[PDB]
Amino acid sequence: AVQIGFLLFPEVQQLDLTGPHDVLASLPDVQVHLIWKEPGPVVASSGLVLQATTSFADCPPLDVICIPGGTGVGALMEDPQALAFIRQQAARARYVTSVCTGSLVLGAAGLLQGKRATTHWAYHELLAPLGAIPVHERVVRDGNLLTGTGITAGIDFALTLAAELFDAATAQRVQLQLEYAPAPPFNAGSPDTAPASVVQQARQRAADSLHKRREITLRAAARLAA
Amino acid sequence: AVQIGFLLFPEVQQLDLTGPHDVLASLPDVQVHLIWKEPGPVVASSGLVLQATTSFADCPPLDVICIPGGTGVGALMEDPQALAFIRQQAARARYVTSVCTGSLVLGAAGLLQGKRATTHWAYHELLAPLGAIPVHERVVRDGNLLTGTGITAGIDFALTLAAELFDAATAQRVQLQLEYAPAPPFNAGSPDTAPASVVQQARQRAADSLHKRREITLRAAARLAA
């Protein structure tokens, strides 16, 4: 059975995780794990309560690891237990993936050094200090690393993973079973397509968070420099 | 505060719910409820454990009600307590919505009689016996009823609801904050675009479920005829 693991942490953006989870859980011969320091409740940034299924120590060797994003990324970037677990699993995983600001956690773990990667548009300037080559594309692959942008990036890249782990017909069947054919009613999902006034509002709303994450990123980079 | 409620039931397809939940929970002055017979754990069809936040009796009057789909829809179609709750809330709600096979629950509750509606492609033949005018479109509106197809239909229609409850700039801001710009790597999300061989596989995999739901639908229609 293919072993797929998601890191589940306080203040996660739950859709970053629950989207790819439902897609990948639809495949045959897959086991999906929700990983934290111990099994039990973990609260997402919206207040939704999820349940971790396994601890770091008990998690099996993973074929796929996925790091979601969210408000809670700042704490994770300085959590030595979580970063060590990610490094251990990434060493043998076939795929190391992230959604949105989850790539900043991969960066803090040292896994983006010299690698092409993306992250959420408002935090993209934090990739270079973590050693990455920043790329402004929705899905960026570099070897076995796959970083994606957008709250539903993991739905789309989960179909890619399905095709590579199984075959294209299997990925197509899952897409059809889920009737997955999105059609957003607005075209404001990128700073390059949204109205300038909307970009301004979104930027100011993110400013305090970006400021705090600049400080965290510099401490995380100092640890990588040692 | 706008009151938004999702029905959370055993064997729900969790993404049908968790997608619109994360979008709508991002709006100001909204309270989101996960409703079942009592607060506590509810297991989705994938094994993911969610937590209902309120009972039927304690739920406030809702401005928006959303019925997700999933395997568990068959039991709900013959659950008189759940159907009565849905009817009560739909009477005063500004919007009555569903995702995927959730529209079959609205049908069992009598809320599709004479109304245009859609549902999951493999179960679409069950709409007419529940009194609906079946429509093969991804989002179908009829008055204050909005039925959508696809595991992520609620993400897209949540942006529509945001624009109507607030304004277009608010919907655009949420889309940008979430960097929501999907781009599926395959084009098999409809029986009209998927390869015929994939459609066949998906149809045979759904056949036992469709057979059981034909039986349930006929009993539900008999109750509406009384």
Q: Residue B68 and residue B5: Cα distance in Å, rounded?
A: 11
Helix A153-165, helix A14-24: angle, nearest 10:
30
Task: Tell me which chain B residues have a C-beta less than 8 angstroms from the C-beta of A50.
Answer: 48-50
Is residue A150 left, alpha or beta, with left meaning phi > 0 and alpha meaning psi from -120 to 50?
left
CB contact under 8 A, A176 and B197: no
Closest Cα of chain B to A225: distance in Å? 31
Report yes or no: A157 and A97 within 8 Å, Cβ to Cβ: yes
Taking an 8 Å cut-off on Cβ atoms, the answer to whether A152 and B152 are in contact is yes
**Cβ–Cβ of A195/B172 closer than 8 Å?**
yes
Q: Specify the resolution in Å.
A: 1.2
Cα–Cα distance for residue pair A40/A51, rounded to 1 Å: 5
Return the closest-CA partner of residue B185 out of A157, A176, A135, A174: A157
Q: Which of A179, A191, A199 is nearest residue B190 as measured by Cβ atoms?
A: A179
Instruction: Please list every residue in chain A whose beta carbon sits closer than 8 Å to the beta carbon of residue B137.
Output: none
In angstroms, rounded to a whole number, what is the distance separating the alpha carbons of residues B111 and B106?
Answer: 5
Nearest by CB to residue B179, choosing from A18, A19, A121, is A121
Ranges of H-type helices in A166-195:
168-177
CB A140 within 8 A of CB A117: yes
Instruction: Please say if B100 is a catalytic residue.
Output: yes
CA distance A123 to A5: 25
Query: Taking CB atoms and an 8 Å limit, are B182 and A177 in contact across chains?
Result: no
CB-based contacts of B72-75 (< 8 A; 24+ apart in sequence): B72/B9, B72/B10, B72/B11, B72/B12, B72/B45, B73/B101, B73/B102, B73/B104, B73/B105, B73/B213, B74/B209, B74/B212, B74/B213, B74/B216, B75/B9, B75/B10, B75/B11
Strands B139-142, B145-148: pairing kind: antiparallel
In A, minimum Cα distance to B193 occurs at A176
Experimental method reported for this structure? X-ray
